[PDB]
Design a protein around this ligand. Structure first.
Ligand SMILES: [Cl-]
Lengths: 234, 234, 234, 231
């Protein structure tokens, strides 16, 4: 319905938000390719290709190899944990690489391609951590603030070329990566109890917003950072 | 099919964004009640009722008279024109009454009722003027900043009761009221030429986002202000 | 030394933050006039004039009657308390009148005057409530968000004239009116203990920032909102 | 009189905003040490030491070697130019190292020390580019947004220990680096609302407030001083 005739690439489509967005896009009629470290995770759900988003050459090769790209979703990311003194140089470099530099490359590859094919939509999954300080997320927040600034910079520069660039900034969403950090879904029951809404977000809730941004009806949004966080940053 | 179960009330559903939202809500399966000063405009389009949002008793009577209310959309508003010295006390009183005070009343009426029924979704149509300073919008900008603050306050307070409260913040959208502002359709191209995208927003672009926020998929968004402004605040 | 040869008007200079600003201004060499409902509180401290900031005519008459005005400080304000359903129309009208409309009037009177003399500085005392949602401040936060938007709108309009307009956004500051709504000392003390810094802000901490903004060294700040809130909005 | 008896370290104190801050601190009574790649620029005027802020070991050694430290200013930085496609990975690495990672290190060294010795004030010189998008500043904007996020994170974590952490976010300030980037200045001043560039002294006076006892209620703040350019 809403994405028929659109060609989409979703980076880190193997699980969680990335996967939910790939599945939602396909449901709305998009031709979707899910790039991920573990394409077997997508066996029989969405077309998939192996991609390590840390690999610049592979990111440029994949995007430049596509015939047409209408929507690019950057869902790749890692959540280092720790306050200022717990954080290490290795945390810093790993997180800035995957959370921000990877997206830099993907946009470098995709935006000219898109501009030269008329237009497009780029959707970066950031985090509410870009705006809201919480304990033990020193490195993570810095990477995500960088990502939002980059989203807006790209949006301004390519607006005259028909390419929209936006970020979605989720709060705490129940994902496989969250479960392994918090120890299963009843590990999650504790923190879900602390939320205002007494529950955690769903990947589907984030995917539906991405569908909007990818759609023809999302075409007047650019340079925006959409917070979906259950009121946690209030 | 995103709203098939839901009862929605749209205040100022007669034209522009409010009407686009009402029509879109209708298309997505919702039972819509359109309140407006001119109910004839919704004849054969959406069920309607006559309402002057400046009248506190009328606002409370309408909302408290409803059996069940799943979605409330506050699309009422006036756009006074002028810088600081051109602005009058009459502009101030009229704009704060309609743009802000009437929403205060609508929310006072609706949020307890929604709280009791287990949840719901309130959507305030604010403006990017709440965040982005532009010339000749002194009063308008103050009212819309007030409105976003109220949106967040209500969101925090009723999040435990499962009632979401969010704002959409449009940029320059082609509406009957903008056209009357611009002195006619002839005055629109000047506005469009100032836009990064070289075109004005479409009310449908705002409506699609309201559908997301009214839907079950929007249930993790609360206290957010969604900017859809064609990049103008970059 | 820092405000030598400056003429300053402080509205609501009779107590709290307003008084600290007037005293600090005078210490730094400015000629100061403290306008207040209660001029008796300033005798033998700063030159004083009776002024009810709710009275539009009186506000214009005082400001237009001054020979030269280099600095205007709007420190007037009231803090109603309550959530959405506790808040009243009385609260709304009173708070919007004093916190926002009176500043509208004062800037209408002052800014063209300052613009004609080639520069000046307007300092509005807003609140971190303009940005940060806290329980029980529904009306207050709305009025202060309005005030910050007005600050920026005026700043943009009069920047080419060399007149700066800025807001200081304090957190919880120890003032007679805070103690009037807390108790006097005992808690009061309870609230202080619970704060991040385990103390309330001092009026002098806001006043020193006001000195910067009023001074020639503050001439490159305009349209800014300076948060001084003991970290409470983090 | 605003900083009597305070001991301050200013990193990249050799020119521009860092230099103005070091001189202002001294006029306000502080004992100042200016650290810089070019201490010869400060000599006779401000006590100075050579420091390359890119060298992690050097940063920790200087800071942990100080007797006492009441105020730390991170004024180090670089402004790469270019849009998305112009920007290079080398631009990225060099700007994130100096603009952000070196501040990470300086705070890791200084904050625990301050916490154990009666608190203090850390002032990071960011940029209004952290908030306001302008053409040709893709990398720069990313680094300064990271820096503001870091400022707020550190401020929350160390508020309970008497340490304040704040950022000043300048607009376009007349500095030797700007002049080299750009007479030249004129064309860039014409397209400013105030029809002129910021002065380093205008930033420095705000740093004095933040460093002072009267600035102690500010923490986690990002103070914009940009001539209205982000309006
Ligand atoms: Cl008073």
């Amino acid at each position: 319905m809403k994405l028929k005739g659109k060609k989409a690439l979703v980076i880190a489509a193997g699980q969680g938000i990335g996967r939910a967005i790939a599945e939602a896009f396909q449901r709305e009629g998009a031709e979707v390719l899910g790039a991920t470290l573990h394409p077997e995770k997508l066996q029989g759900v969405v077309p998939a290709v192996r991609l390590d988003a840390r690999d610049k050459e592979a990111v440029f090769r994949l995007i430049q190899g596509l015939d047409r790209l209408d929507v690019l979703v950057n869902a790749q990311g890692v959540v280092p944990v720790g306050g200022l003194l717990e954080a290490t140089d290795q945390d810093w470099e790993e997180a800035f690489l995957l959370n921000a530099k990877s997206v830099f490359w993907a946009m470098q590859a995709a935006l000219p391609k898109m501009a030269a094919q008329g237009g497009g939509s780029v959707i970066n999954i950031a985090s509410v951590a870009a705006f809201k300080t919480v304990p033990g997320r020193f490195i993570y927040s810095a990477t995500k603030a960088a990502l939002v600034a980059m989203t807006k910079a790209a949006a301004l520069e390519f607006a005259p070329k028909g390419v929209r660039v936006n970020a979605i900034c989720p709060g705490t969403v129940d994902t496989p990566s969250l479960r392994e950090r918090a120890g299963g879904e009843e590990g999650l029951r504790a923190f879900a109890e602390r939320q205002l809404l007494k529950r955690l977000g769903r990947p589907e809730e984030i995917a539906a917003l991405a569908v909007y941004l990818a759609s023809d009806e999302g075409a007047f949004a650019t340079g925006s950072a959409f917070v979906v966080d259950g009121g946690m940053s209030l």
